[PDB]
Design a protein around this ligand. Structure first.
Ligand code: HEM
Ligand SMILES: COC(=O)C1=CO[C@@H](C)[C@H]2CN3CCc4c([nH]c5ccccc45)[C@@H]3C[C@H]12
Ligand SMILES: [Zn+2]
Ligand SMILES: [Zn+2]
Length: 457
C-alpha cells in the first residue's frame, strides 16, 4: 500500500527537472500533472522491474484525446499511441514482419542503405571543404531509407515536395511535447473550441495531409498482381482482405497514421543520433581516427561497408553505442500506463497511473557506468578490446513496447556512420568556437547547432 513519495501541488527542461527530484525522493517518485497521476521511474532496476517484470501490466498508453483531430478511433490508433490490445498488436506485428520480409536482415536492405549512404557522401563532398550544418542532409538520407521501405520510393535531396515533408515532420514531432497538449489531454473538454481546435496540431495535421498526397499517388502506381514491394502495399493488400470486417485495424484512417508513426521515427531518431555522432567525432578527433583505422583494417576505402564487418569492428561498434548512450536522444521515452496494480522497488503503483520511464537515468546511471557524463567508448569495451553491451544500454527501452525499429536503426547507424568516416575526415571549422557537447531538448534531444568541415581522404 506504500505509494511513491513526491512533491504536492517545467515543460521544456523536463529531463533535468526529474533528475532533481530523483536525488531528493528516490528512484521511484510520484508527481502531479494537472488531474493526471504520474509516477517517474529512474535507473535500470526500477525501469526493468516496471517494463519487464511487470510487462503485461505496463504495456498500455495513456489516453490521448487530442488524437481525435487526426482521425484516431478504436481501430485506428497507429502503433506509438495505440492502446494496449488488438489495434496495437495487429499493427505492431504487421510492421515487424513486413520490415523483415522487405529485406531487413538481408543483403537486400543492407545494399540499398549503403547506396543512400553514397548519395550522402556526394552531397557532403559538394560542400568542398567549406563549413556547413550536416543535419539537413542527414535527415534526407535517413528519410529516404524509411520512405523506401514504407512508400516504395526515395526523393532527390533538392526535391521541393520532399523538403516540405521533412519540415512538417520535424515541426510535428515538436508538437508531441507541449504544455497545451498536456492541458487538453487531462482536460478533454477544451477540444470543443473549433477555433482553439485547429491550432493544437497545426503541423501534424498538415504533415498527414502531405502524406495523404503521397499515399494517393502510391495507390495509382500499385501493382496488386505483384508481391508487395513496400510496407504501404502490404498494408493495402491486407486492407483488401479485410473488406467487411469492422474489427480490422487495416482501414484507411489507420494507414496514414501507421505510416506517419513509422516514417517520422525512422527519420528523426536515427539522423539525430548521427548528428550526435558527427558532433562527438569532431570533439574527439582521437576517437574518430581510431575508428577510421579499424575501417581501413577491415574494409579499406574500396568497398562499401557491410553488416558482416561489424562483427570484426568492435571499436566502431563501441563508439556508435556510446554515441547513443551519450547522445541520449529520448530522455523520457514514451509514457506508459499501468493497466493493472503493481509493485515497483517496494512502492505500490495503482492501475491507471501514467508511467514515465527515465531512460536518461539508465543510460547515465552513475552506479553502472565508469564515466556517465563523458563521451567514453570504453564503456562498451574491455581491456582486451572486445565489445560488451551492459544491461543498462536501453536507448530503445524495454518490454512489449520496446522500439520495433531497433534492427533497422542498428544497421542504419553502422552503415551510414562507417560510410561517412570511411570517406571523410570531420573537424571543427578553424576559427570557430568549440561546439557545446550539450544538447537542446525538443521532444527529442538534439545537438546544439554546429558546423563542421568534411575533407575527403
Ligand atoms: C536511434 C534510433 C531509435 C531509437 C533510439 C528509438 C527509441 C525508441 C523508444 C525509446 C521507444 C519507446 C518504447 C516504449 O514505449 O517504452 C520506441 C518505440 C517505437 N519506435 Fe523506435 N527508436 C529508434 C528508431 C526507430 C525506427 C527506425 C523506427 C521505424 C522503423 C521506430 C519506430 C518505433 C515505433 C513504432 C515505436 C512504438 C513501439 C510500440 O508502441 O509498440 N523507431 N523507440
Ligand atoms: C509530424 O507528425 C507526425 O509524424 C505524426 C502525425 O500525426 C500522428 C499520427 C503522430 C503520432 N506520433 C506518435 C508518437 C511519435 C510519433 N513519431 C515519433 C517518433 C519518435 C518517438 C515518438 C513518436 C508520431 C508522429 C505522428
Ligand atoms: Zn509501392
Ligand atoms: Zn574480452
Amino acid at each position: 500500500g506504500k505509494l511513491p513519495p513526491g512533491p504536492l501541488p517545467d515543460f521544456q527542461n523536463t529531463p533535468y527537472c526529474f533528475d532533481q527530484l530523483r536525488r531528493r525522493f528516490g528512484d521511484v517518485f510520484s508527481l502531479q500533472l494537472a488531474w493526471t497521476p504520474v509516477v517517474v521511474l529512474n535507473g535500470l532496476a526500477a525501469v526493468r522491474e516496471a517494463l519487464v517484470t511487470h510487462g503485461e501490466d505496463t504495456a498500455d498508453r495513456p489516453p490521448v484525446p487530442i488524437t481525435q483531430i487526426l482521425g484516431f478511433g478504436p481501430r485506428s490508433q497507429g502503433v506509438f499511441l495505440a492502446r494496449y490490445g488488438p489495434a496495437w498488436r495487429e499493427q505492431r506485428r504487421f510492421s515487424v514482419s513486413t520490415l523483415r520480409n522487405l529485406g531487413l536482415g538481408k543483403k537486400s536492405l543492407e545494399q540499398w542503405v549503403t547506396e543512400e549512404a553514397a548519395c550522402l557522401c556526394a552531397a557532403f563532398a559538394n560542400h568542398s571543404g567549406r563549413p556547413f550544418r550536416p543535419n539537413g542532409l542527414l535527415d534526407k538520407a535517413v528519410s529516404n531509407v524509411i520512405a523506401s521501405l514504407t512508400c516504395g520510393r526515395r526523393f532527390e535531396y533538392d526535391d521541393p515536395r520532399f523538403l516540405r515533408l521533412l519540415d512538417l515532420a520535424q515541426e510535428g514531432l515538436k508538437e508531441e511535447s507541449g504544455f497545451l497538449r498536456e492541458v487538453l489531454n487531462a482536460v478533454p473538454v477544451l477540444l470543443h473550441i473549433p477555433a482553439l481546435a485547429g491550432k493544437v496540431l497545426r503541423f501534424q495535421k498538415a504533415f498527414l495531409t502531405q502524406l495523404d498526397e503521397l499515399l494517393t499517388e502510391h495507390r495509382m502506381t500499385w501493382d496488386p498482381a505483384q508481391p508487395p514491394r513496400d510496407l504501404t502495399e502490404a498494408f493495402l493488400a491486407e486492407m483488401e482482405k479485410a473488406k467487411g470486417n469492422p474489427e480490422s485495424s487495416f482501414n484507411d484512417e489507420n494507414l496514414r497514421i501507421v505510416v506517419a508513426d513509422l516514417f517520422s521515427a525512422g527519420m528523426v531518431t536515427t539522423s539525430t543520433t548521427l548528428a550526435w555522432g558527427l558532433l562527438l567525432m569532431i570533439l574527439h578527433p582521437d576517437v574518430q581516427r581510431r575508428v577510421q583505422q579499424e575501417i581501413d583494417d577491415v574494409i579499406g576505402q574500396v568497398r562499401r561497408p557491410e553488416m558482416g564487418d561489424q562483427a570484426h569492428m568492435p571499436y566502431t561498434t563501441a563508439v556508435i553505442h556510446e554515441v547513443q548512450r551519450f547522445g541520449d536522444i529520448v530522455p523520457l521515452g514514451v509514457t506508459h500506463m499501468t493497466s493493472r496494480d503493481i509493485e515497483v522497488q517496494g512502492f505500490r503503483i495503482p492501475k491507471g497511473t501514467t508511467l514515465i520511464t527515465n531512460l536518461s537515468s539508465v543510460l547515465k546511471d552513475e552506479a553502472v557506468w565508469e564515466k556517465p557524463f563523458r563521451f567514453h567508448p570504453e564503456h562498451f569495451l574491455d581491456a582486451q578490446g572486445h565489445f560488451v553491451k551492459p544491461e543498462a544500454f536501453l536507448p530503445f527501452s524495454a518490454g512489449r513496447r520496446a522500439c520495433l525499429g531497433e534492427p533497422l536503426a542498428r544497421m542504419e547507424l553502422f552503415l551510414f556512420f562507417t560510410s561517412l568516416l570511411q570517406h571523410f575526415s570531420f573537424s571543427v571549422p578553424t576559427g570557430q568556437p568549440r561546439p557545446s557537447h550539450h544538447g537542446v531538448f525538443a521532444f527529442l534531444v538534439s545537438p546544439s547547432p554546429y558546423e563542421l568541415c568534411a575533407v575527403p581522404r
